[PDB]
Amino acid sequence: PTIAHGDGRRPSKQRTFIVVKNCHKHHISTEMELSMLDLEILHSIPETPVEYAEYVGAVKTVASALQFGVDALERGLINTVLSVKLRHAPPMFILQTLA
Amino acid sequence: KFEVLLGVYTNAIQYVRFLETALAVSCVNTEFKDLSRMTDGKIQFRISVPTIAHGDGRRPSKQRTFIVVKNCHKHHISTEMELSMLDLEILHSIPETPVEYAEYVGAVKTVASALQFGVDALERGLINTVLSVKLRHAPPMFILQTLA
Amino acid sequence: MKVQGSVDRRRLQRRIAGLLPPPARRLNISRGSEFTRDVRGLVEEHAQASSLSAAAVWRAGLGWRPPVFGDFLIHASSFNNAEATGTPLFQFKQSDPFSGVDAVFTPLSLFILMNGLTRMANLLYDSPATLADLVPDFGRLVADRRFHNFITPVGPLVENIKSTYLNKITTVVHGPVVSKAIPRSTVKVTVPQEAFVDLDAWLSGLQPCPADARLYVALTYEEAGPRFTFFQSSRGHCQIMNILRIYYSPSIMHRYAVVQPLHIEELTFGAVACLGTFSATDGWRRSAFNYRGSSLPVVEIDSFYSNVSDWEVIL
Amino acid sequence: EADNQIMGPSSYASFVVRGENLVTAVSYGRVMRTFEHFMARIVDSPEKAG
């Protein structure tokens, strides 16, 4: 929008701006290890108390690995959002006068 | 695999009315339907000023009256809008098929907003004119202080 | 009112449970009923893997990489019982009797035969005259320069069953180095740090970095006897030879006197082979031997894929 | 200042590709943001000035 003015100056016709923004995509990767011995017994059914002990040890370690992984992805999310915020933040000494 | 138009936004122009501004405190707003006829205005003050009697032989000042005249000043305000002749053309014809109806409604919306802009520009003109008139008769402070 | 988070564990559990390969089929021979049941499972699996009629009978959806083991038998003098596992070894050919000993050779044994590292090699081998008895024509084959044709590379050793005179030895020939006794525990390969030249730094826009870096082996007849060198490079089989010749030129300049104008059998300066491939962008690791008189620093490299090459002439 | 507490949403705002967008994704390879909105603006009401 414009202002009407009484000076002889020429009036400005109507104007519209069309601006386009586009996305930034971020990629995230982690790793998980599972020992082959730990994987083998999970399929089998334990019968002796020793096999019960080995089965429960395997399930504990596996659950630990999975929980650590999902926490790794949460932390990665927070790091990526913080990097996004920083890369598009100009320094102050510019922006106090640019604003 | 696809690409997505995930957001469409358009700015909204807030109306600005003179009476809602605090600046309007410093004015008196009269609606005068046919202003173009008034050639010249006039206000005439008549003021009577008394004096105090004195015991000295001093020559006395008689009865005092002053006659002050003030006059109107006029202002002209104008803005220019541009309309594409195709829009003003298709506005008249009826719609034949729904694509014609979509184009018709887009056209009438565009021209309506083109006039919204005009009324808004004229309002900003009113308010700027009052502010400039006030600035023209505002002498600076260091002159005003010792004169008051 | 917990947040529930941003990622879901059910998805991960499901997709990983999908990724696990089905278990190997144990067969139980001691008990009759278990044997019968596993045989029933076997016939059902063959019916499930070979019939184009059905679709669930299609199982190929979603590598076999042990090494090729080769066993050699060697005398207990021509090998220290203490020598570390994974050192590349090189083999020699006997003329008539081969079953008695194979006479496989170690780099320190070559340094001894060819005449700090010297003292370590003597503290391994004080009286290495058996070493001279293994090659009768050593003094002949240095001059006939046929020494490289007979020294064939065998690569890293995995296991050595220890006996009084003979030694049982298992050698990685082709493929990645791996063991056998357990679920295939890995090994690494060691070469002494001295008498090893890094030809990627000997000459040191931006040079490109390949995925795989190779180790070559070369044998040179200098006036100070023969000597062996292994080269950690990455560029290409067509450029490593050129760069190596440029390297040896100062040593090549000395051979004008020894060469024979009449008999052309001695002229070759050396030969180059390619042993195997390892991961670049990593480097190698530094360690010393732990023997009685051990003072030699040694480079050791992970991820060795043993792909031995032949000796190629360079001059 | 003795507040040390704010309030925010507990779960993210979900967005899913429905059939009306799925046909456009399959054929034309483009998806619109919440097609329901643009359809309620364009086809259902003639003006519905914003």
From Swiss-Prot, chain A:
Q: Where in the cell is it found?
A: Virion; Host nucleus
From which domain of life does this come? Viruses
Q: What the protein does?
A: Self-assembles to form an icosahedral capsid with a T=16 symmetry, about 200 nm in diameter, and consisting of 150 hexons and 12 pentons (total of 162 capsomers). Hexons form the edges and faces of the capsid and are each composed of six MCP molecules. In contrast, one penton is found at each of the 12 vertices. Eleven of the pentons are MCP pentamers, while the last vertex is occupied by the portal complex.
Which family does the record claim for this protein?
Belongs to the herpesviridae major capsid protein family.
The record's subunit annotation is:
Homomultimer. Makes the hexons and eleven out of twelve pentons. Interacts with triplex proteins 1/TRX1 and 2/TRX2; adjacent capsomers are linked together in groups of three by triplexes, heterotrimeric complexes composed of one molecule of TRX1 and two molecules of TRX2. Interacts with scaffold protein; this interaction allows efficient MCP transport to the host nucleus. Interacts with capsid vertex component 2/CVC2. Interacts with the small capsomere-interacting protein/SCP.
Q: What is this protein called?
A: Major capsid protein
Curated annotation (Swiss-Prot), chain C:
What is its biological role?
A: Structural component of the T=16 icosahedral capsid. The capsid is composed of pentamers and hexamers of major capsid protein/MCP, which are linked together by heterotrimers called triplexes. These triplexes are formed by a single molecule of triplex protein 1/TRX1 and two copies of triplex protein 2/TRX2. Additionally, TRX1 is required for efficient transport of TRX2 to the nucleus, which is the site of capsid assembly.
GO BP annotations, alphabetical order: viral capsid assembly
Q: Which GO terms describe its molecular function?
A: DNA binding
The record describes its quaternary structure and partners as: Interacts with TRX2, MCP and capsid vertex component 2/CVC2.
Q: Quote the InterPro entries the UniProt record gives.
A: Herpes_1
GO CC annotations, alphabetized: host cell nucleus; viral capsid
- Report keywords, A-Z: Capsid protein, Host nucleus, Virion
The protein depicted here goes by the name Triplex capsid protein 1
Which compartment or compartments is the protein found in? Virion; Host nucleus
Q: Does the keyword Transmembrane helix apply?
A: no
UniProt record similarity statement = Belongs to the herpesviridae TRX1 protein family.
Signal peptide residues are none
Q: Does the keyword Metal-binding apply?
A: no
From Swiss-Prot, chain D:
Protein location: Virion; Host nucleus
Instruction: Note the subunit structure.
Output: Homomultimer. Makes the hexons and eleven out of twelve pentons. Interacts with triplex proteins 1/TRX1 and 2/TRX2; adjacent capsomers are linked together in groups of three by triplexes, heterotrimeric complexes composed of one molecule of TRX1 and two molecules of TRX2. Interacts with scaffold protein; this interaction allows efficient MCP transport to the host nucleus. Interacts with capsid vertex component 2/CVC2. Interacts with the small capsomere-interacting protein/SCP.
The protein's job, in short, is: Self-assembles to form an icosahedral capsid with a T=16 symmetry, about 200 nm in diameter, and consisting of 150 hexons and 12 pentons (total of 162 capsomers). Hexons form the edges and faces of the capsid and are each composed of six MCP molecules. In contrast, one penton is found at each of the 12 vertices. Eleven of the pentons are MCP pentamers, while the last vertex is occupied by the portal complex.
Q: Which family does it belong to?
A: Belongs to the herpesviridae major capsid protein family.
Q: What is this protein called?
A: Major capsid protein
Gene that specifies this protein: MCP
